């Protein structure tokens, strides 16, 4: 359609002009103007928790856009999914996995 190809061209022009704007800004900044330890594993733990719960979040993302088309049995399935998610979260909290302080 003409409207969808107009929106595609608008999005492409938006991306190109934004990239060109920031690149030209950096180029003008460079051109103008004269010249003259072992980290603690809690970082890995919190990033790993973010990865796992982001995958669980993607499952809930897929569920949320089709809640009406899934019916009450989909609600029961997603309630079991969310309950397992919350049991894992309670497990992580209670063993001090999510406690940054010692």
């Amino acid at each position: 359609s003409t409207e969808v190809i107009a929106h595609h061209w608008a999005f492409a022009i938006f991306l190109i002009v934004a990239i060109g704007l920031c690149c030209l800004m950096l180029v003008g900044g460079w051109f103008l103007g004269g010249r003259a330890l072992r980290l603690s594993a809690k970082f890995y733990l919190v990033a790993m928790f973010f990865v796992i719960f982001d995958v669980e979040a993607l499952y809930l993302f897929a569920w949320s856009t089709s809640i009406r088309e899934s019916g009450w049995v989909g609600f029961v399935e997603a309630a079991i999914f969310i309950f397992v998610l919350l049991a894992g979260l309670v497990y992580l909290v209670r063993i001090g996995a999510l406690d940054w302080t010692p």
Binding site: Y59, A62, W63, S66, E69, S70, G74, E77, A78
Partner: peptide
Amino acid sequence: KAVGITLF
């Protein structure tokens, strides 16, 4: 939406 329909 279709992926969520077939997912559940």
